[PDB]
Amino acid sequence: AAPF
Amino acid sequence: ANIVGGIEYSINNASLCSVGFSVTRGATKGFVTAGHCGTVNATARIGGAVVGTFAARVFPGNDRAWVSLTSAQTLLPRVANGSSFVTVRGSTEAAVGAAVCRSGRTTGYQCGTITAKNVTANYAEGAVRGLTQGNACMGRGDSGGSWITSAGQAQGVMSGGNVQSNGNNCGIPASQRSSLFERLQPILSQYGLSLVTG
């Protein structure tokens, strides 16, 4: 996961 | 600018995010978005015009922000679904398994279901906990956008997910998607905001  | 959930806005003429929901604070107008989109005091623009600045935010830990707007803005109880609109009718939180949709400037309006609650995302700038996970796809540019049920209950704002190299997770199956939003309830109580409804 990565913010966006 | 007319404020509608899902439309684009830039931050200090650089990054792009999407509007989550129109809210008020006393006589003040705003919209809730993702904390990671801006820092306190960053300038938000909608179609090249200044509409406001970040009033407060939290990121990492949480992922929330509210932008206060000039008086000239028009807040509406709506979320963009192509050329049509979903009316925001409230904030009842849906359970795991409920269907839900999300609107943002990069992938438009995608629907899916809630797979999990209270997830922790280990972002590079640090963890964010208490996220709800959905399988609707999304991509870069989508953060801050609305998560809402077809019936109108606002759920939260777009935080992050497993983007592949094409910049989204729309090219892999629902079962392999992890799309995390920040719950809206806490953002409304934390900042004393009321949702604009219709």
The full set of domain ranges for chain B reads 3-76+184-196, 77-183
> Contact, B22 vs B3, CB < 8 A?
yes
Rounded CA-CA distance B55/B41 in Å is: 6
Which 3 state secondary structure label does DSSP give B9?
strand
Q: For domain B77-183, which CATH number applies: 2.40.10.10, 3.50.50.60, 3.10.150.10, 3.30.465.10?
A: 2.40.10.10
Q: Determine phi and psi for B59, rounding to 5 degrees.
A: -165, 135
Is B142 known to be catalytic?
Answer: no
Rounded CA-CA distance B8/A1 in Å is: 22
Is B143 known to be catalytic?
Answer: yes
Tell me the β-bridge partners of B44. B11, B52
Q: Active site residue: B22, B63, B91, B103, which one?
A: B63
Q: Is the dihedral of CA B162, B164, B167, B172 positive or negative?
A: negative
Q: Residue B89: in which H helix or E strand, if any?
A: none
Rounded CA-CA distance B168/B130 in Å is: 22
- Of the candidates B11, B5, B6, B8, the residue with the CA atom closest to the CA atom of residue B44: B11
Residue-by-residue DSSP string for B125-142: TEEEEEEEEE-S--BTT-
Sort out which chain A residues have CB atoms less than 8 A from B160's CB and list them: 1-3
**B12 backbone φψ class: left, alpha, beta (φ>0; ψ -120 to 50):** left
Shared fold status for B3-76+184-196 and B77-183: yes
- Of the candidates B1, B30, B72, B18, the residue with the CA atom closest to the CA atom of residue B193: B30
Q: Give yes or no for B124 touching A (CB within 8 A).
A: yes
Structure determined via: X-ray
Å between B61 CA and nearest CA of chain A: 12
Token pair 């993702």 in the structure block, residue:
B34
Q: For domain B3-76+184-196, which CATH number applies: 2.40.10.10, 3.40.367.20, 1.10.10.10, 1.20.1530.20?
A: 2.40.10.10
Tell me the β-bridge partners of B26. none
Rounded CA-CA distance B196/B22 in Å is: 6
User: Nearest-CA residue of chain B relative to A3?
Assistant: B160
Tell me the β-bridge partners of B145. none
Check A2 against B34: CB less than 8 A apart: no
Token pair 């008020």 in the structure block, residue:
B24
Check A3 against B125: CB less than 8 A apart: yes
Encoded amino acid at B52, one letter: G
Token pair 């509406």 in the structure block, residue:
B76
